[PDB]
Design a protein around this ligand. Structure first.
Ligand SMILES: CCn1cc(NC(=O)C2CCC2)cn1
Lengths: 412, 412
């Protein structure tokens, strides 16, 4: 047997806003957070734009001195985590601190810090490298710093599954609670890969949109004129909680997390199979885990990265899994607005999936001006669609053919 | 309901050998793998030695075409994974490929590749960053590449929990099998952090031994003259398999994985608490998970980093958990010989713990010339000790106060 898991707290930094409600207001208005990247010379680069977090004040969370020790991706993950825990109303005590853990991940981790410490090393030598270089750059330090700050003594770990990180982080945290290893987990992901290395690295692979002239139109999932993904920064964190634990303290419950699927494509290092066999296996695994028929799914938050092969693989996967229900569900890519937060994508998209349930509205896929060949599903083109949503899926597909699917259900 | 998990295959690169048997012969003979580093000029560094993998031939494992794309930490993790899968005798088929997954992690990942690409970026511009920069550096690509080349379609993920990574990776992979999410997992870790940023960043924290003039004596866990950890490179991988699956195919079973614990110190970003409270909580969780009397523990493969505070915290934790039985068990640090493989430490030490069970011998803590105040347990000083071992425990502790413990026992 298995315990039930609900969402009692959410937190976010995104290109749309410095918290959940501002981000979500942008999402339902079809607003783009994409813009040319500032305070950075990108002349030599084929991509000059992305989704930056705008106006982030780390001193709302940390002293300047503790903030100086940490890469931006860690600052962003801590901000989302602190928001989520505050939003949950949870009181940590000696009676429960061993039952409260953290799993906040990242796909790429501390590139900005690595870049700045490379500058020191090359020019001046190793004696200029910061003493906090390692602990301030390693991916497990969101989980680490959060546990130390809040006194959390439960399971403490971090996933790194590239663009699947946030989805796997939340799913494996839900398993920890379901199987009695924890009663509460803070789970999600964070990313800040807008350094030369991030834009240069994805740029060297020709993976990014190069629509420098119209950055807000660059992320156009399933549109025939798409030319790759848009790199974005930020963080998402959820408070996952055992149902009886949440009820006993009178928690506000957003939604129930009923299913989690994982699969490997075993296909290609960076490309998904054109038929989306791996994504179909992963969604079937998640629905089986939830004890739900494909027909019960109402809303899918796609991975929908705006890459040629990825977007078409997801259409094929949804048609394969859902058959005669494939057109009845609504599927949208919020990456059309936020761009691709890499390891944080799954985290912010799980939050948008939960709010789709709260508000009974499918967020839009903006920029979907000319659907590509066979992209004929309800992709919620251009504008939000109020509709019935009892069951919402959130899919992530990443490098190494790593797949994750979360299934959320309305709670009443 | 919870299934039993056995070890059917093991694989390793270490500073003592290019496979498990060669490494283990070095362990039982008290041999040091530590020597001045040859691959780069460290005259400006305060530490100029570590545990290198000597004479690694990537063309035993990978085409020159695949190998050139991948950071050394990925090559090492693939070498160990391939060894472990071959050692297991498992045949991958259409009938079982969806039930076989991988969880190979790293603490730091592709720091050499990222450094070298940062050098190209700063000197030559973004168009000289490798197209393989991202997939060839990010931590999840051991799991990814292994899945692509063996056709593993089970759970595909990667942990990054600093010096706890290998232990967490193996434990969580065992839970996947226990709970029915997979029947087989390849799990462990790999590390190659011996670049300027690695040695420079740990050096900036004054965390490394600076015994440059006697490298083989630098790693001296619980010795009063210890002055920090020794940085080492390599990989460990285990094939974990559900018991009845292993029995059904007539697998050779090395041992059973009976217990896994995790805990967070919630104390300090890098420092372990002096009393080892988090390590004690972690071990108690693992022993309760294994349904054991603590008196059943015969051998402990310590974390044993050769740091002043870490080594004494572990003594305090073992005394607190085992009481009078702390005086009857044997505890040793194989890091005395291998140095600290960081995210791979828990993986090679899990293999050493299984071989302690196979061969009924406690590996030595070499260099333990003068045990420090309170270090009065059986620490197997200097020479391997043949003894009865029914139950072996492997401990890891890392930055962020993250703790893992694995419990293995003989299988008959
Ligand atoms: C992918 C090719 N491959 C090569 C190995 N080699 C070994 O297992 C031996 C070398 C030490 C033990 C396994 N797979």
């Amino acid at each position: 047997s298995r315990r039930r898991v609900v969402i009692t707290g959410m937190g976010m930094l995104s290109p749309l806003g410095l918290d959940v409600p501002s981000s979500w207001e942008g999402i339902l208005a079809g607003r783009s957070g994409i813009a040319p990247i500032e305070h950075m010379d990108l002349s030599a680069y084929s991509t000059r734009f992305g989704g930056s977090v705008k106006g982030f004040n780390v001193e709302e969370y940390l002293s300047a001195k503790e903030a100086r020790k940490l890469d931006l991706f860690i600052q962003y993950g801590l901000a989302a985590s602190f928001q989520a825990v505050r939003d949950s109303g949870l009181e940590v005590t000696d009676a429960n601190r061993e039952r409260i853990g953290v799993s906040m991940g990242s796909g790429i981790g501390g590139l900005t810090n690595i870049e700045n410490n490379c500058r020191s090393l090359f020019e001046q030598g190793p004696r200029r490298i910061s003493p906090f270089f390692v602990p301030g750059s390693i991916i497990n330090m969101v989980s680490g710093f959060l546990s130390i700050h809040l006194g959390l003594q439960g399971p403490n770990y971090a996933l790194t599954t590239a663009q699947t990180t946030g989805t796997h982080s939340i799913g494996m945290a839900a398993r920890n609670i379901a199987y009695g290893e924890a009663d509460v987990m803070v789970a999600g992901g964070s990313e800040m890969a807008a350094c030369g290395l991030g834009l240069g690295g994805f740029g060297a692979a020709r993976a990014l949109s190069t629509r420098n002239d119209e950055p807000t139109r660059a992320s156009r999932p399933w549109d025939r004129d798409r030319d790759g993904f848009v790199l974005s920064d930020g963080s998402g964190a959820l408070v996952l909680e055992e149902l009886e634990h949440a009820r006993a303290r009178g928690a506000r419950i957003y939604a129930e997390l009923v299913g989690f699927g994982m699969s490997g494509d075993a296909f290609h290092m960076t490309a998904p199979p054109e038929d989306g066999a791996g994504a179909a296996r992963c969604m079937k695994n998640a629905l089986r885990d939830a004890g739900l028929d494909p027909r019960q799914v109402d809303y899918i938050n796609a991975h929908g990265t705006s890459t040629p092969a990825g977007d078409i693989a997801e259409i094929a996967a949804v048609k394969s899994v859902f058959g005669e229900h494939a057109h009845a569900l609504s599927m949208s890519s919020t990456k059309s607005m936020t761009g691709h937060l890499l390891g944080a994508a799954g985290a912010v998209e799980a939050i948008f999936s939960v709010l789709a349930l709260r508000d009974q509205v499918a967020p839009p896929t903006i920029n979907l001006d000319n659907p590509d060949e066979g992209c004929d599903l309800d992709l919620v083109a251009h504008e939000a669609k109020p509709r019935k949503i009892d069951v919402a899926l959130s899919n992530s597909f990443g490098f190494g053919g790593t797949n994750g699917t979360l299934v959320f259900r309305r709670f009443a």
